Amino acid sequence: AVVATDAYVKRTNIFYHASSSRLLAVGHPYYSIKKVNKTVVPKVSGYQYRVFKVVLPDPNKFALPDSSLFDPTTQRLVWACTGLEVGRGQPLGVGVSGHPLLNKYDDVENSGGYGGNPGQDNRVNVGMDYKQTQLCMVGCAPPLGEHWGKGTQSSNTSVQNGDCPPLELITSVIQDGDMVDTGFGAMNFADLQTNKSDVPLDICGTVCKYPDYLQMAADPYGDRLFFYLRKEQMFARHFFNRAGTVGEPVPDDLLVKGGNNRSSVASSIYVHTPSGSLVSSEAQLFNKPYWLQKAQGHNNGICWGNHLSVTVVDTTRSTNMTLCASVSKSATYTNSDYKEYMRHVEEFDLQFIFQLCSITLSAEVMAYIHTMNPSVLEDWNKQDPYKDMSFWEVNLKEKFSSELDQFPLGRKFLLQSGY
Amino acid sequence: AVVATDAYVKRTNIFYHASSSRLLAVGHPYYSIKKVNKTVVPKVSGYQYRVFKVVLPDPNKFALPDSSLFDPTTQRLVWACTGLEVGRGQPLGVGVSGHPLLNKYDDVENSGGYGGNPGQDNRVNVGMDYKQTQLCMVGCAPPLGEHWGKGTQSSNTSVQNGDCPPLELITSVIQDGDMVDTGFGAMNFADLQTNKSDVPLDICGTVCKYPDYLQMAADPYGDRLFFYLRKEQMFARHFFNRAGTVGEPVPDDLLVKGGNNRSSVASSIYVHTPSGSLVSSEAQLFNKPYWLQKAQGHNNGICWGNHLSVTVVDTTRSTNMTLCASVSKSATYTNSDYKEYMRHVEEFDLQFIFQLCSITLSAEVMAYIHTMNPSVLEDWNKQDPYKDMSFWEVNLKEKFSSELDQFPLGRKFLLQSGY
Amino acid sequence: AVVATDAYVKRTNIFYHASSSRLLAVGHPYYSIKKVNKTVVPKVSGYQYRVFKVVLPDPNKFALPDSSLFDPTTQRLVWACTGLEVGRGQPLGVGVSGHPLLNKYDDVENSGGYGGNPGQDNRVNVGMDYKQTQLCMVGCAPPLGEHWGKGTQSSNTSVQNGDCPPLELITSVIQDGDMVDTGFGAMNFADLQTNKSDVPLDICGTVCKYPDYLQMAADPYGDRLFFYLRKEQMFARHFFNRAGTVGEPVPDDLLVKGGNNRSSVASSIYVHTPSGSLVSSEAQLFNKPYWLQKAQGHNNGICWGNHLSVTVVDTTRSTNMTLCASVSKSATYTNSDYKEYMRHVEEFDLQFIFQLCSITLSAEVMAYIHTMNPSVLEDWNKQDPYKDMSFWEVNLKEKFSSELDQFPLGRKFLLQSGY
Amino acid sequence: AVVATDAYVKRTNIFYHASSSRLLAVGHPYYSIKKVNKTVVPKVSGYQYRVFKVVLPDPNKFALPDSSLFDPTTQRLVWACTGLEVGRGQPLGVGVSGHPLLNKYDDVENSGGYGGNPGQDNRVNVGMDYKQTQLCMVGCAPPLGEHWGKGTQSSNTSVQNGDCPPLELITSVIQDGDMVDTGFGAMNFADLQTNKSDVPLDICGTVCKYPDYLQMAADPYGDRLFFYLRKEQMFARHFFNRAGTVGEPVPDDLLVKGGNNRSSVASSIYVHTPSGSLVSSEAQLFNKPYWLQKAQGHNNGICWGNHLSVTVVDTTRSTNMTLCASVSKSATYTNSDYKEYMRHVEEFDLQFIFQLCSITLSAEVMAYIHTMNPSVLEDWNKQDPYKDMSFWEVNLKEKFSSELDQFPLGRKFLLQSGY
């Protein structure tokens, strides 16, 4: 049986403050710009995931003003997350995405008559604004996400080229720079949409993942996430019709065949342009301190291994600025005289407040932990369990301080904690 | 270590009221009108910042009804801000901005077929309403803002004319008459948009700044801002496509080249017309007293140097009235018979309530202060630290009064303070 | 120093109820209809001000059931407003306004290409809905408003015909039948817009005033308004461009001249069609009793001179009904067979609750009052100070009654007053 | 003086439950369908009034389980309404109304140029959604409404055919099946709009009434309504211009005559298409029990005469379903093969909870009542005072029961009443 950390982890009055200070990300909203070689301008979209891997200093080395606090022979130290605040700079705004060649055939919302039939290539320049999403979740382990990917066909009828691919719910570790569901669902467009032209550039070549809350919530121990705030909204702006043969035509029993032009049923493969309504300060999730006092799982904010993963998604600041430089500052206004570009920006400032804890390594405690996270013990005395994955490394080792009243969150803390 | 002002600044029961009374600004919403020489009609936009430099009378001179209150040999007097109310006249409304030659090529929200390709100069007359914004912040030092400016290239490949300029987060002192982010982000359009036609006239030639909250909040002492109320909202009205060569074309791996007309991929440099929903009294920020009782920083409203900076931004009253005078009052309706103009207006009435404080200049106090703000001491016995900057000077020297019940805010005060 | 009425006005337990009962206004929404002589059908718009001059009976004559209550030799009687309720009939709805010849040249929200240039007279039939506004304020003096009018040029360069007129903030007494700001600001269109075609008929020939709250609030005594509820909301529906020469062209430094058609910069004199969102009962201001127990000013509801001014603005019931009568009831449907008309309606029912008060005329009281309102004394023992002004006279002399439980507001009162 | 029923009507602990059970109305939304003779398919619109005449059993006959409760010689029994719940079936939705030949000339919201002039008959097929309205009011007397009807001209200038009719505020008894104000105001379109084509079919031939709250509220006794919940909302969808001669042209002083096409001023008789925003459960009024504990009037829910009138208006369930039957089930899709129809539906279930009361008929009580409602006495020992009027008769005589816990409202009651 799993037990609440509150049962084998002694707490103290030692609190420290830590902040990563200003963090900037600056790139192209839709795709990375590599000079036909290496990546120079990285892809930085507002609809991207931000998974910060916050590294804390190992207290079992740290030099305290006191040292009579315990027996380094029978007990060990651990950092526990007391509260955090995800600072967010830059003004509020929405980000436009599009595709020069979107597979958007006919507008079905309100269309006059049964026009002709599409020939070859009817793609058109389309642009819209994605679904608004604000979310944040802390844990001592990377977050889990879900998306739909191409499955594996069994020993069945040879899949004639063009058959609808098999859907599979894939679970994975949400990494930094991953794409958020934008309104076309959480799926791997790269693999399920061969034409590379069914959704905006910023996602038509990757995967859009969605937090696998239900799975994490059932985590036996609860290291994945012991806190989370989600806020997503969206409505249907326009109604479209795709171009291309209809893999699965409309059944006869469902319609009354028409004559003349109508004799050729139109594409019944509908789609809609998503859109988030307005964004406002009132609904702002971040820039507000969150005090975790009682996790819903068994791990009550214990940063095992001196690690701490903070996932963040914020589209409320997705303005994609545009800038152009001239190349012929003289002719009378000539479009060719200029080069237009796309640049997006992200501004963070992660600040936390941790509390020193101890653990007397009794026979039984040693056992429970070894079954829970053998790593934890093996360290209290190597390779990275997530070396392949990519997270925004945030090193906070030389960033701790017990002078709480010297920092905004610290001040807020003392205040809130009454004493 | 920085200490809370509440530890070395004694408070009293002496309260005074002060108000700047009616303040008017009247000009042209988009640009200043100089008669080809000097500036006559100033630029007064609703989307402009209002940084009032409120000057208070030096209490260490002031003539009180009493004078036994202290020893002018060991202690000094300081004004502390207790509360204020930013009066706002004129009705509610929104302000239209535009550009006769905006670089708005094709509407991408919903466009028919793959039109032709732009030639030279396709600019069109466009008009929209900006992002709604209400904010206010007090401090004993000017506020800090952020915007993106043209950076400095290192000893790298010669920047071929037309290359995308380098972005740099510039920090600066928000001055009166500065531009607020309107939906196209906080950047210096003058420098990043060479064509001078990518955004409305009221901002295509200047900088749009955004409060650098995170930086001010981390102010070691906290003189920048000890109070602030922000409220911004906005949505995407229309989706546009710019004209001009695409500095960074869409990568091959992201699309399936098309033949015929489609063979020439369209501009994938999207943009959107911003818009603030409705404005209503319910969301009104101003015309309401704000009682600062416990600043979040260490400076609890102490107006060091007898100064006080009040920043204000209010677009809820940005109606840009129009007026026309005739030149041929007789002909049968002829457009040429009239000259149309643009005029905007702002109406303020800053009223405050200050509390007299004292400070015994002990050895240690003298030290702390000298490190904090040497100026403060050097005065208690010159050039302006912000002579170059421009603020709306509000002189309140002959405006103080201890007859609280004779003024609206005063009345409100007594009431609120129970006694 | 001004003193609170609560200091020299004794209160009693005598309360009376009074109501004006049903009040109807029925006319034309845009202009009055005079048969080329006298005014028959008056102008009754929803966006009109309603300033009721409520006349009360002079208690210093009134015949009470008791009369031992005081010495008519040393003290006088005064009515104090305890509470009121502005009854409003007719259903909720919005009112359409328009102009057959509005100076609306090109729609700038989204316009294709640089069309040609306007010739002479391009005015078009336009119609929209104004900014929603609900407000109400009581006082013993008429309300003050503000609007922009044509100023007076000093001894300067001869104002060449057509120069932009000089703006002046004019303060005035808001009279019944005045126009409310509708979204084009508070100004005197008659004088600032020579072409008579820049805004709807209901306002293109008059002034739109806005309550001068700030000025009234600073009223030394506070007889102007001791209570007020305001609720206004609005958004930008469409974006227009005016026709007529541009008095102040766009500065060269702000744009890159274009060649060809673009060589002639379009009118940069933008405007927007206002609109109030939906109206709903939830936001209804009226038909709810308001109990004034502690005025924000010094006059706590004392109806000096037995007068009482109640200003009201309510556009939530501005439906402009249409009706047509036939002239050839037989022909096969022929437009000429009918005459269409426009009629608006207003339905009020002002009910109050007053409290008898007394004032011993001591030497000092006599003085204070004589300085405050000499009239008040001169009466306690003539011409109208507002004879020229026009208010909706509401006589309540024969309308008082001490049988509170016999009237809805009375019942509400007893209830609310607990006893 | 009128006295509160609570003074002469003794209450008891006897409570009963009653419900009308399922009530269905099924017909045509716009007009009744009579087979050129008698009415078969009745008109059942969502924007119709529902005035239920709930008949209760006369307790002065009723057979109780007890009978020692009083002296049938000196006192009488009366039913008092304690609480009710208006059950509503069918899903939420809006109802479309229209007119094949609506007098809608030119769209004035945004129209290009000064088009030509209308000839004869320009009516067009128009369709929209009405203003949303939810209301409910109980009383022991039918509700009062108001609408504008054709008045009566005095001994004045012979009303030349076509002159604007005279408006009169007509008060009447709101009957079942009456029309609710839908956005074109409360008036008698049949009489004020001769062309029969100015508003949708469902109202162009009848009257739209609005509750005369103010009048009922002033009811000396208060039998009209001792409870009421109103909730109406609406916004302006489109702006129209009517066709037909302008009875009262625009005054010269208001405009600058134009000179070519413009020389003929267009119709300045504007109108707007109304619309209710979305409907949602959150704003649902019904399907919630209402406990009347203290009426605002003097009659605290005393069902004099064993009658009870319940008025209801609910447009939140106005979906107008469509259905078609074939007539040539074989040909290759041919419109003529089918007949389309219109059918609306209403589902109610009125449930109440009454409380037995008594009244000792003392000399004085007999008097008060005789003056109040002589009928009441004459019965305690004939023709219908509203025989001509039409209400939805709801007989609850055999529907009473003292087994409260056997019914939903009963259960809710016991719960709510704590005991």
From Swiss-Prot, chains A, B, C, D:
GO terms for biological process: endocytosis involved in viral entry into host cell; virion attachment to host cell. Gene3D superfamilies: Major capsid L1 (late) superfamily, Papillomavirus. Signal peptide: none annotated. Its main location: virion. One of its GO terms (molecular function) is structural molecule activity. InterPro entries: Capsid_L1_Papillomavir, Capsid_L1_sf_Papillomavir, dsDNA_vir_gr_I_capsid. The keyword Disulfide bond applies. Pfam families: Late_protein_L1 (PF00500). It is found in: Virion; Host nucleus. The keyword tRNA processing does not apply. Keywords: Capsid protein, Disulfide bond, Host nucleus, Host-virus interaction, Late protein, T=7 icosahedral capsid protein, Viral attachment to host cell, Viral penetration into host cytoplasm, Virion, Virus endocytosis by host, Virus entry into host cell. GO terms for cellular component: host cell nucleus; T=7 icosahedral viral capsid. HAMAP family: PPV_L1. Self-assembles into homopentamers. The capsid has an icosahedral symmetry and consists of 72 capsomers, with each capsomer being a pentamer of L1. Interacts with the minor capsid protein L2; this interaction is necessary for viral genome encapsidation. Interacts with protein E2; this interaction enhances E2-dependent replication and transcription activation. Forms an icosahedral capsid with a T=7 symmetry and a 50 nm diameter. The capsid is composed of 72 pentamers linked to each other by disulfide bonds and associated with L2 proteins. Binds to heparan sulfate proteoglycans on cell surface of basal layer keratinocytes to provide initial virion attachment. This binding mediates a conformational change in the virus capsid that facilitates efficient infection. The virion enters the host cell via endocytosis. During virus trafficking, L1 protein dissociates from the viral DNA and the genomic DNA is released to the host nucleus. Belongs to the papillomaviridae L1 protein family. This is Major capsid protein L1. It comes from Human papillomavirus 11. The lineage of its organism: Viruses, Monodnaviria, Shotokuvirae, Cossaviricota, Papovaviricetes. The gene is L1.
